[PDB]
Design a protein around this nucleic acid. Structure first.
Ligand SMILES: [Mg+2]
Ligand SMILES: [Mg+2]
Ligand SMILES: [Mg+2]
Ligand SMILES: [Mg+2]
Ligand SMILES: [Mg+2]
Ligand SMILES: [Mg+2]
Ligand SMILES: [Mg+2]
Ligand SMILES: [Mg+2]
Ligand SMILES: [Mg+2]
Ligand SMILES: [Mg+2]
Ligand SMILES: [Mg+2]
Ligand SMILES: [Mg+2]
Ligand SMILES: [Mg+2]
Ligand SMILES: [Mg+2]
Ligand SMILES: [Mg+2]
Ligand SMILES: [Mg+2]
Ligand SMILES: [Mg+2]
Ligand SMILES: [Mg+2]
Ligand SMILES: [Mg+2]
Ligand SMILES: [Zn+2]
Lengths: 97, 214, 63, 25, 127
RNA sequence: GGUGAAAUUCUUGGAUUUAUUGAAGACUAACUACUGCGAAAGCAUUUGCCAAGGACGUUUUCAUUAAUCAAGAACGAAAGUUAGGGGAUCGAAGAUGAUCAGAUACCGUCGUAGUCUUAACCAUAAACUAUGCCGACUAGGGAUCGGGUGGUGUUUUUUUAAUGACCCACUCGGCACCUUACGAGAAAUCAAAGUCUUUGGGUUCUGGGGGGAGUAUGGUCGCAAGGCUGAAACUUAAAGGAAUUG
RNA sequence: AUUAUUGCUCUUCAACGAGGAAUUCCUAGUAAGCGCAAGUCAUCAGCUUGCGUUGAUUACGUCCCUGCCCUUUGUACACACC
């Protein structure tokens, strides 16, 4: 039978949210069901930070990361990213990590 | 059997007045031959340089600037205002969750009759001792802040061209008169003009252009 | 050629999907007081002496 | 068969007896 | 100190673009792409390719007149993946580590006040 | 270029990349949330106008004027249909490149209708909370949304205030989550799905094994597609639900 | 005893110059080299079951490959994915 009180995900007092598109497979999905992550990462990376500053002007410069919000589609969310599948209980747990 | 560089005319870029280094960078053209000359052809390019790269200091890392090339003289071509942008990183940082965003804009003419559109962005701030984990303005708030912001901009322009407006923006006088009137309505943080684009120049007037040079 | 001598001061574990590689923190003897972590190939215990062929550069994870 | 394609199966089926009956209206 | 130009690195998947121009943009100077320095299509975006072309680009960059350069790294954008391709990093790395200078770089990835239907339909690319 | 990998494709017509401008139509990113509003469908740029509404405050007004509803009526996602416009985008159909034993598909390309808009139709969605509305009673807790009240609360400085934002206690009415469970259930679970063999507050609607079948038929609505109403013969001992162990 | 059981002598003197893709076994008296006894057996070991003789190199780890166990999860399967 029913196997979530949030049903799909997060929708109480509305009836129609609005669809966004999966970043991975372009599948439409109700934004409130979407499953999202902020991709904040540095512009450079791991090792490049030394060889960066070394062959640059300015003192150490500044460094300005990238920021983009990722929308996945369940199937896509499950096939790789945040998902695993949790036990009938751990499921309920909304707390991030 | 050509290699355009063993042929390319060459050139250095000079900045205008109200900043730091009038010297900027370099370019490439094509030799001023009869039929197609290095002059009239291009020149009228534009160059985007972060003003921290042109003001020296680093309390200006954001705020990109569009300089347009109008006139030329013997390996020395001057430039005038053409716009102002923000670094993509800055915004993308500035716009955090859990808080209201507010934008607003306006079109308007200046003394030396350039026509432009400037923007403005501000976010609501938590206020030191606030318990509730988000802080949101009340829409009635947001209509008001936009109105105030709008009134403020329509004054700060048509003061002596972009010339004074350029001089106006650089020390962000506007940012804080905004901040001033604002705080009667709602907290708020950041608060900048973000962008401004040019959409109607007047005429050359080779004299007036020459006023930023010496 | 600059040869650089360093003494193993702890054994941290095996990396490499295979696992033939071991992570270890060393102390160079030609002026101590500074430490870098390197990656071995052969078997290692504490108090051994590695020839850091290039003095300053270190790794972490191995796949 | 998928419930909805069965709905379509008969939709057609009705439209044909619709056709065939008209022949003798 | 230097003579400055613009780098502009388009990094998508299945290929990586590097090409410096005059800071005005109007006038080029030397391009070459990741698809140039290898032949396999499959390997048209790989970091190893991006290296060899960051190499070929730095060469003519210094062999003509640009001692230094600002970069505007870029992904596909529009209504696509927005995230940086693989060989963007390798390219930047293999141009600062070449012997050219670096100065103040930003992301120019076209982000829209969203729209124009994304490709591949409501049910998405399924396989 | 595109993919797991390719190919159909595009490239002296300098493709792809770059720069400066311009146009067309769509859309409203990030802020966006267990947050708002609406009868439901649904509704996220600004500004003006136009009427509309709930909650709250109220020692105002009227005084039973109400609850729920066969018939009948207003609205009603998406596609679809008529006639103009619009036709950027994506893209039923079609044609293709690959894949396959096959491959009418999945993946790739071309791309008609459509996608948007006006005037009119159509009236259906897992139109879902798969849970009728009005009234009462029964139990704990922290957040939040709107209103209000209380305060020698914080922060704003100017000369104290006045403001506004904040904080703390209460109180209505919201969207919800938590823990319990007196209680209920076949169970999963449920502050209602409780106050039911100790069986009655008021009222509407639907079901009575499975298939036959939402089929036949008549009526009726529609341009159509189809909507509403809607049987029987015959067949059949299970179909089904929730939980358990494999 | 021919299609030659085996043993001996003379003569005849091949391929094979370290073995492609692949793939087996193994951690100490072990691997590998080496012969013996027993089974079979009238006769026949290039097999096997044990035996002792000589005696290393290299790990003392991991989840990459492969194999399998365990959870979790889905199931309309329970004659249980043949
Ligand atoms: Mg299920
Ligand atoms: Mg709905
Ligand atoms: Mg006839
Ligand atoms: Mg799949
Ligand atoms: Mg917006
Ligand atoms: Mg009715
Ligand atoms: Mg009647
Ligand atoms: Mg079209
Ligand atoms: Mg087809
Ligand atoms: Mg075919
Ligand atoms: Mg077909
Ligand atoms: Mg229905
Ligand atoms: Mg639902
Ligand atoms: Mg309560
Ligand atoms: Mg008060
Ligand atoms: Mg079940
Ligand atoms: Mg024997
Ligand atoms: Mg045998
Ligand atoms: Mg089970
Ligand atoms: Zn997806």
């Amino acid at each position: 039978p029913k196997k979530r009180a949030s049903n799909g995900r997060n929708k109480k007092g509305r009836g129609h949210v609005k669809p966004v598109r999966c970043v991975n497979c372009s599948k439409s999905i109700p934004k409130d069901k979407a499953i999202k992550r902020m991709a904040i990462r540095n512009i450079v990376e791991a090792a490049a930070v030394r060889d960066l500053s070394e062959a640059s002007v300015y003192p150490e410069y500044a460094l300005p990361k990238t920021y983009n919000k990722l929308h996945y589609c369940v199937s896509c969310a499950i096939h790789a990213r945040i998902v695993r599948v949790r036990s009938r209980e751990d499921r309920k747990n909304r707390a991030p990590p | 059997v050509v290699d355009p560089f063993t042929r390319k005319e060459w050139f250095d870029i000079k900045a205008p007045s109200t900043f730091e280094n009038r010297n900027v960078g370099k370019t490439l053209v094509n030799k001023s031959t009869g039929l197609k000359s290095a002059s009239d052809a291009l020149k009228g390019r534009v160059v985007e340089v972060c003003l921290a790269d042109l003001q020296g200091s680093e309390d200006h890392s954001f705020r990109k600037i569009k300089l347009r090339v109008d006139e030329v003289q013997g390996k020395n071509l001057l430039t005038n205002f053409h716009g102002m942008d923000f670094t993509t990183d800055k915004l993308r940082s500035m716009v955090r969750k859990w808080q209201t965003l507010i934008e607003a804009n306006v079109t308007v003419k200046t003394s030396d009759d350039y026509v432009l559109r400037i923007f403005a962005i501000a976010f609501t701030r938590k206020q030191a001792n606030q318990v509730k984990r988000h802080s949101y303005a009340q829409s009635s708030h947001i209509r008001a802040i936009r109105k105030v912001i709008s009134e403020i901009l329509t004054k700060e322009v048509q003061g002596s061209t972009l010339a004074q407006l350029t001089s106006k923006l650089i020390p962000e006088v506007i940012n804080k008169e905004i901040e001033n009137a604002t705080k009667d309505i709602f907290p708020l943080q950041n608060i900048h003009v973000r962008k401004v684009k040019l959409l109607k120049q007047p005429k050359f007037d080779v004299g007036a252009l020459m006023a930023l040079h010496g | 050629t600059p040869v650089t001598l360093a003494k193993v001061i702890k054994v941290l574990g095996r990396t490499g999907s295979r696992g033939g590689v071991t992570q270890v923190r060393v102390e160079f003897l030609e002026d101590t007081s500074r430490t870098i972590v390197r990656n071995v190939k052969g078997p290692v215990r504490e108090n051994d002496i590695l020839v850091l062929m290039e003095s300053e550069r270190e790794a972490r994870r191995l796949r | 068969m998928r419930a909805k394609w069965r709905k379509k199966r008969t939709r057609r089926l009705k439209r044909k007896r619709r056709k065939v009956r008209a022949r003798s209206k | 100190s230097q003579v400055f130009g613009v780098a502009r690195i388009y990094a998508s998947f299945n290929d990586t673009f590097v090409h410096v121009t005059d800071l005005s943009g109007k006038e080029t100077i030397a391009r070459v792409t990741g698809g140039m320095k290898v032949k396999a299509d499959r390997d048209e975006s790989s970091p190893y390719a991006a290296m060899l072309a960051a190499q070929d680009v730095a060469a003519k960059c210094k062999e003509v007149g640009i001692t230094a350069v600002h970069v505007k790294i870029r992904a596909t954008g529009g209504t696509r993946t927005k995230t940086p391709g693989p060989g963007g990093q390798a390219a930047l790395r293999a141009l600062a580590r070449s012997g050219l200078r670096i100065g103040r770089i930003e992301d120019v990835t076209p982000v829209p006040s969203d729209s124009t239907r994304k490709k591949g339909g409501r049910r998405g690319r399924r396989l």
